């Protein structure tokens, strides 16, 4: 989706995460590696605002 679309349709603008976390099976002795989709990570604009559910939100620092 694009930024304009997201705000218009109230969807969060975010990026997908695909990791192929495959090392080895339990007892089959055969590596079964599959690119699993863990979730979505929000993206920040160049100005610093992230659009979540159609609402521009900011993150304030802390001391």
């Amino acid at each position: 989706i694009k930024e304009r679309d997201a705000v218009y349709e109230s969807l969060t603008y975010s990026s997908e995460l695909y990791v192929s976390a495959g090392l080895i099976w339990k007892n089959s002795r055969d590596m079964q590696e599959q690119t699993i989709f863990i979730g979505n990570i929000p993206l920040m604009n160049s100005l610093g605002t992230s659009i979540v559910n159609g609402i521009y939100r900011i993150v304030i620092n802390q001391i």
């Binding site: 695909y18 192929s20 599959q34 690119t35």
Partner: peptide, 11 residues
Amino acid sequence: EKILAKEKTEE
């Protein structure tokens, strides 16, 4: 899509 998913489906 055309690379990782293709290599996973083919191999």
